Amino acid sequence: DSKAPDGSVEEFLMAQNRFAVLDRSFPEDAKRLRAQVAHELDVRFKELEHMAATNIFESFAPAGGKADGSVDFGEGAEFCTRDDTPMMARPDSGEACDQNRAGTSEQQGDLSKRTKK
Amino acid sequence: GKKMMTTDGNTATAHVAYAMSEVAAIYPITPSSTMGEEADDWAAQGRKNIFGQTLTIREMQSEAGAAGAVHGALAAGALTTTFTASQGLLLMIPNMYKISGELLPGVFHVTARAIAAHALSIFGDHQDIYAARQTGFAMLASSSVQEAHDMALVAHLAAIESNVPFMHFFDGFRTSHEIQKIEVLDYADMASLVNQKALAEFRAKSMNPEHPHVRGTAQNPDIYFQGREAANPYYLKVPGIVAEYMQKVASLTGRSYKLFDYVGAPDAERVIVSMGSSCETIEEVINHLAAKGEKIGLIKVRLYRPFVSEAFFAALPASAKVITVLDRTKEPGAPGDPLYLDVCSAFVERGEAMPKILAGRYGLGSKEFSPAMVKSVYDNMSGAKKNHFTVGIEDDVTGTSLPVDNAFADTTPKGTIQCQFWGLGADGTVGANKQAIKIIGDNTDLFAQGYFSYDSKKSGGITISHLRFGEKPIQSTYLVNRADYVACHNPAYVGIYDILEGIKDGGTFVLNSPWSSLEDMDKHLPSGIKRTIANKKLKFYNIDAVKIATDVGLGGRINMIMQTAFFKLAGVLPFEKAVDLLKKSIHKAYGKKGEKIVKMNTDAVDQAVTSLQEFKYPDSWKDAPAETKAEPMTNEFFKNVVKPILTQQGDKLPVSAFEADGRFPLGTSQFEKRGVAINVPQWVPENCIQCNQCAFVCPHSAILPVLAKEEELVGAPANFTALEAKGKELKGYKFRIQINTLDCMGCGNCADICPPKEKALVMQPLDTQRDAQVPNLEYAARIPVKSEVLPRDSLKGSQFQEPLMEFSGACSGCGETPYVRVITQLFGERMFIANATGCSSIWGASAPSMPYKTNRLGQGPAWGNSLFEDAAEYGFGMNMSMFARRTHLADLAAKALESDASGDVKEALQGWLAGKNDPIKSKEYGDKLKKLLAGQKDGLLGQIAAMSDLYTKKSVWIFGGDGWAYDIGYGGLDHVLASGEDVNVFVMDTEVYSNTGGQSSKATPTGAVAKFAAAGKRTGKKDLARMVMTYGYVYVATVSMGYSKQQFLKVLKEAESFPGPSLVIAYATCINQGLRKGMGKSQDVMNTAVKSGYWPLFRYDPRLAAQGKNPFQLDSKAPDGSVEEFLMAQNRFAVLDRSFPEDAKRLRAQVAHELDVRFKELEHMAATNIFESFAPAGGKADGSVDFGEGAEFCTRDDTPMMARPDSGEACDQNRAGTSEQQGDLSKRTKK
Amino acid sequence: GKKMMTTDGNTATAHVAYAMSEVAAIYPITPSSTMGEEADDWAAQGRKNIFGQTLTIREMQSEAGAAGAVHGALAAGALTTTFTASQGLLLMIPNMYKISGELLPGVFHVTARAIAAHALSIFGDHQDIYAARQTGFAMLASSSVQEAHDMALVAHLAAIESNVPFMHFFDGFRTSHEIQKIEVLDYADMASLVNQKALAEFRAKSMNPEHPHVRGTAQNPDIYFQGREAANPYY
Amino acid sequence: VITQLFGERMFIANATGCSSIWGASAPSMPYKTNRLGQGPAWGNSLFEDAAEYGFGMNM
Amino acid sequence: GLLGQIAAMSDLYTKKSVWIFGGDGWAYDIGYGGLDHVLASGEDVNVFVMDTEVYSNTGGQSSKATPTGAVAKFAAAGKRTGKKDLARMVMTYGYVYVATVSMGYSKQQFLKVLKEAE
Amino acid sequence: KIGLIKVRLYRPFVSEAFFAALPASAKVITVLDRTKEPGAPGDPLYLDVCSAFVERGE
């Protein structure tokens, strides 16, 4: 909604004591810092122009839709989804599951084949 | 209507909270998490509150956010509640003052948990609730599961009528997680007790623009005091209102309560005053002792605040001569704990009889408070009368503890059957126990109690179940110490733990093992067990559960077999009926996939019953030959502290065994060697290409690459096979991949990614590798690590570095530990770690196991966990210290240069000063100074010599999970990165709050199922990376080990070397995500995460911008279209597809769209020619200036807030217009 | 020496805090703001503490952030202080348990101010300091401007030697903003009272990868209680 | 100006600061009702929780 | 009956406008974590930030909204870090309306923002 | 005949030091607290002082 920097930033800053007071006490640093601010707003405005000109923006797909009910993340999982500690213990926890101490599914299957007997 | 059921304290409480509330703002924290989760489930299921509406519940970013939201909802006229504890409750304190201050009918349900001081504890005590006693909330305590339900209802009804908020609390775990058969009221009954007039007034006084008011004004000294006292009438009426509802609820339940209740001898001479679950055990002991004539009693505190002395004295027997007030907390330096002080004030004010009053401390962090301890407390009042004592510990330091005679007889009511079950993590024991409780509770008149003790180790941990059944109510709020039935579901335990401790004579002992024959039993069953069994005439039973399970086709799962064992030999119910219910329940449950599965379990029962036959043992067992200590070598600390703790003897360690500040030494995990893997990798040298990738990926450091010279393999074992080292730099060396079979967790990641199609690593049964590898690992360990051969930051070279974090308690295949282990291989010897609470702090420092260790030179990560919310600030503080102290050292060095110091010294000092912030140069010259100044103790050189630990440039790291980084700790993280100082943040993103049970975080992706996102999260993953990149001066990067180990190493070096703030976000796989084929596919999943475009890799380096180059660099490629399979291969997404296929499809499509747009945005960022500049410094100088110096007009107002010592000078306050307007007016008023 | 000069409670306290500290993590809140601003202005001017160094002071995003930073600086061996009150002090409570639990010589200088309940107040009372009485911090009160200076010094010296953190407090406005002619000690005199061996031991036990330790472990019921009682000798 | 557009039906969760000080320093209350008695329902919780406070009103 | 319950809820008939008012110190520093979470929620609330580029009420202390070179307490030699870009950080969500205004530049743009944001 | 006991070290609260400053002639003692803890049987300093007398048992 606004236009590119018109070059009056130096006057803008010096018309406020929060900036001018530094120029009076530490002129060298102040001069450097006011130039830095000028550069910052220059870069930023360009980035905003880039945002406005882009043809790629964050759009969203249709949606998810109403969902009557819910489900636990561990329901029907192949391996345990919770550890055996007090922190994950829940009223409905405690059922047996694969704790990943015997390898992946394929590794376990292959071992079975290689062991057959 | 009433209703019986077996449930826990949390559920009993939530049952009421849901009904009585319209809104709930929550945040997860153990052990209150269950309540919020149930509330969410119930709302989703369609459960209605007393108004016929589903509860409106939302998860905030922290408890502070939840408290603010709760305040807002109440101010806006909605009945609101929340669930919290410990650290969480502390963050709610500021809003508690406001909520009570504004007389809002809010209700907090708290599972009282310990506060983190010398250490963190998720266990129960009243340290948290006492910390909020001054906030103005009424405080109502529950002492049992049944009371959790009853007091929760009283709290809500009373809050509504009184307009004073309530904090309903019950003991963390001891009550919150204890299972009991109780009676609950239906919602209609609850609604009938609500004061409709009060409810209407609540709605009417609430915020609303149709009839606005101002709340939260700022007040001066003239009226604040009066305003604070205006609520007095409301507080004076609270107690009567609480009594009113205990009575109204009682008229429906038949269970009566008073503000303070007394139990015991009417003419008691010795009385205890207590609060919480301890009251149950205390009453149990009173019944036993009083029956023997002891004049003892107990006053149970229900309403702690307001504290009504009149009601206290109403419960006090005039015959009391000695009174002991028990507090479940510790306030360092106070003349006494809270309840004790309240009671003292009552007697002082009464101004009459003054019985002897004693203060006692108990149960901190769920410390046992057993009958024997209660006995000590009563004996103390008739004996020594020690004051300000502790009970449950041996304080050999300050001598405040009471002696405890554990020979005290069992005090459980007659007929009570007590059981103990020793199980292996995930073997289904706990689940079976819970079913047994429900089955028995629903089909008999028996009371049932259940309490489970879990392990800190996340995989292959030990779980001990404590169950009780009886004809009389069970008030035993303590572990079972004298069981009638004891089962050991894991034979490995027989020779490592004292599983038969306390079992009654003639008690039943069931063991699961393949040692059917007497020869085998005598071969494995230790002499100690044999002697115990024979001497106590125990009914010993041995069953090969694995064999029976396999034969019936149950794959080998023992859960159903051991369940049968319980129902048949426990004696809680008659055989006939016992086996009846079990079978009927098998049909009730299961009954899913045809009868094929239903029949297997039914058969398992049939076979078990037939198999369960009393093992006949000889009399010679009575005096079997005692074995001999065949224990290896370990530290003195492991022997005296760690070992005892790991063997369930921690309670026996006295106060003198610990450090006053809670510190622990590094490396204690080195001697655990648990050996719980089912399968471990076997190295096949003929196929090995010597790449070290296997070791690089291990989540537990179970792979040790060996590179030794011929001379170093002289006394090496015969099977210690080694290859001739490949690579020009490794010419002459011998290479070997040594597997640590006892620390291995059997995840399979290594064998899964081993490059050669003809795998050089093949998973095999542990028992086929240990005999040969154990001695091999020992020998390998003595071989010097060749960390000088290849570049430290190279893939292969990194694995030739000493890993400084090993054998942690993280889950098998954990996606977090691989990253951390490697980080230590690069900077371990000079890093500080500020770790946010979470999985990384849990596997990182759960006493007594410390996985972080030191290198050969004794250097290692200085590790610390402050809190969950402050990790970034905590690390920033470490950084501030190093800055201040090293600057001090630098000033001293400069002064030393201007002295008569030797040429070599000055030379080193100049060198150090020139490279003090360079890891290489600082160490180079620092080491020279150590030698040159050795022995110097005087003057300037003396001071410099004493600062050697400050010479080498340190590396400050902040570790934390996504929950910390994206939610609770985000504000601090944002501020610390904005500081521009040199700190490194490493975020292990599991896209969920893992440690606490898989709750959603803002890092959780669209459509992923998690607690509080049970229908798939409906907001996309928060883009932390892009938000931080807006600063322009912060190094930002994303990594994924599975996709590229090289990019990860490159990021670590770039991030660490950046002279400013660095943020590294890593993709961490987690069991919560539900990887379909196992956690051993973690690397593959990490790899696909990137290729699919789901997790793109990139780096934002500010210094490139300083040299005129685009700081943003993309390290991965455009989406390859594999996202769909990526998502469906994880249960966190798949489970939704099976339940809500239509929504799931759209949600997965949403993810594909999001990552498509985001990658394109990143590409555009990489192609831009416009980027923010970068500058390290450019000023400082010396001196300061105030913003108001030389201002033409006043720059400060005339209020108390801006007043300063030098303020007060006259100035233009802008009440006469601008300079120009004033000048123009002056011209016009010439005259 | 003993040259009487007029000053207010805040300045009398900051005078001491600056000299006895190496690091400060701050956040503004009336009526304690003056101390932090004075400390920052003095540091900018190059004023030296008892170690001949300028104070390292940074402003955080909130008092919770400030307390976290104070904990970290102390854990890493630097004498640290902060200035706060009321709502700010409440946000520091969680870290206060940690700072005392780890026996760190931190010192909080608090201008006791009312807590916001039925209304907010920037004025003085003990509602804030009493809200932190169970955190394990020693609590030392000043009843006058002169005592603000004296107790501030005692608090720092005692924290260093005892390893128990201190909360030095004085009444918001009634003392923090009252001006009185008092006597303040020069920095050399303050430095002469410091227990240098205790200070050296503080440095030696602090976090450092050259001689690492683990702090902030998580403990089960088997040892937590014992661990909480282990600090008794220090108190 | 904001009140001239939504004043009669707005809730305001105000963070502590100048806006809460000129907004509600007892006994001076600048926010007012219109001729129909409608006006901004104003509240100051704390300095740190303004957004969450407003969020609660919304819930 | 039902009509009675409904009649007693008249102060709920008209759609209300929930606003969160705060300064830059609140939005950019202490309340940022909360502001961030609430905007991320996707619910209908309106946040109005009065950016004075300093903590004004307490005495002019620097905030992350304070610009490079500005002198303020704790920025006694001019702030040496740039102004935090709260606006661009929040726009990354994609589902949050974000806007900046300056009355002196355009009263019309300010009015349009109020209408659009609300 | 009136007096005042000034509290310097509030925590740790040392009863022995409190009594060392209390005149044996004191018949009535008023403990002033500059706070308000709604519902408490008394404010902090008062409760601390009460405990000192109860423990002294004289």
Ligand SMILES: Cc1ncc(C[n+]2csc(CCOP(=O)(O)OP(=O)(O)O)c2C)c(N)n1
């Ligand atoms: C103030 C506070 N609130 C809540 C908790 C409980 N808590 C500890 S860690 C945690 C989540 C950890 O999530 P994350 O940061 O993602 O790490 P992970 O365990 O997933 O590695 C929660 C909710 C706490 N300790 N302190």
Ligand SMILES: Cc1ncc(C[n+]2csc(CCOP(=O)(O)OP(=O)(O)O)c2C)c(N)n1
């Ligand atoms: C926890 C807490 N910390 C500090 C304060 C003191 N305080 C109140 S408002 C404020 C700054 C206000 O700054 P801002 O948000 O920018 O609004 P302004 O006054 O500039 O409008 C400070 C530091 C407080 N009230 N509560």
Ligand code: SF4
């Ligand atoms: S199976 Fe897993 S724990 Fe074992 S060595 Fe391989 S990567 Fe490590």
Ligand code: SF4
């Ligand atoms: S991953 Fe395989 S090929 Fe590579 S070093 Fe390990 S065993 Fe050898």
Ligand code: SF4
């Ligand atoms: S991050 Fe996940 S896999 Fe790792 S220890 Fe935690 S729960 Fe286990």
Ligand SMILES: [Ca+2]
């Ligand atoms: Ca860095």
Ligand SMILES: [Mg+2]
């Ligand atoms: Mg996580």
Ligand SMILES: [Mg+2]
């Ligand atoms: Mg401002």
